[PDB]
Design a protein around this ligand. Structure first.
Ligand SMILES: CCCCCCCCCCCCCCCCCCCC(=O)O[C@H](COC(=O)CCCCCCCCCCCCCC)COP(=O)(O)OCCN
Length: 99
């Protein structure tokens, strides 16, 4: 139940959405999961990852396989955007910690 950042990114070819309830709950889980990964990163790493798109994609893709849920392409891109917003806030809190 861990994620491998060494797997390359694959095109999501599913165009059948999961329900909003499943999508939101998934995003909740993806949020905390990448938060824990990001918080364990070193200082210089969290600087290069906060806005790293490929990093969030690899996370959304891994999490889909592991949780055996298949988002649609559109849902996967929306989930990545969401993880971005979340990471920015995690990072904000970390920076003010450091202060
Ligand atoms: C496609 C685009 C989609 C984008 C969607 C946007 C949707 C908005 C996002 C949902 C809104 C929730 C946002 C909460 C703020 C997040 C920023 C804090 C994240 C964070 O790192 O806090 C960790 C704990 O989490 C926490 O529990 C702290 C959270 C702070 C909550 C802020 C208080 C607000 C009051 C709540 C009212 C409810 C509002 C009703 C909607 C602390 O880090 P750590 O504990 O892991 O460890 C390190 C400590 N040493």
């Amino acid at each position: 139940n861990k994620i491998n950042l060494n797997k390359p990114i694959i095109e999501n070819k599913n165009n059948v959405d999961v329900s909003i309830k499943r999508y939101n709950n998934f995003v909740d889980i993806a949020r905390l999961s990448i938060q824990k990964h990001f918080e364990h990163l070193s200082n210089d790493q969290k600087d290069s990852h906060v806005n790293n798109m490929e990093y969030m994609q690899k996370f959304v893709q891994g999490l889909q396989e592991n949780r055996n849920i298949s988002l649609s392409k559109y849902q996967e891109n929306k989930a990545v955007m969401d993880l971005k917003y979340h990471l920015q806030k995690v990072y904000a809190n970390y920076l003010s910690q450091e202060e």
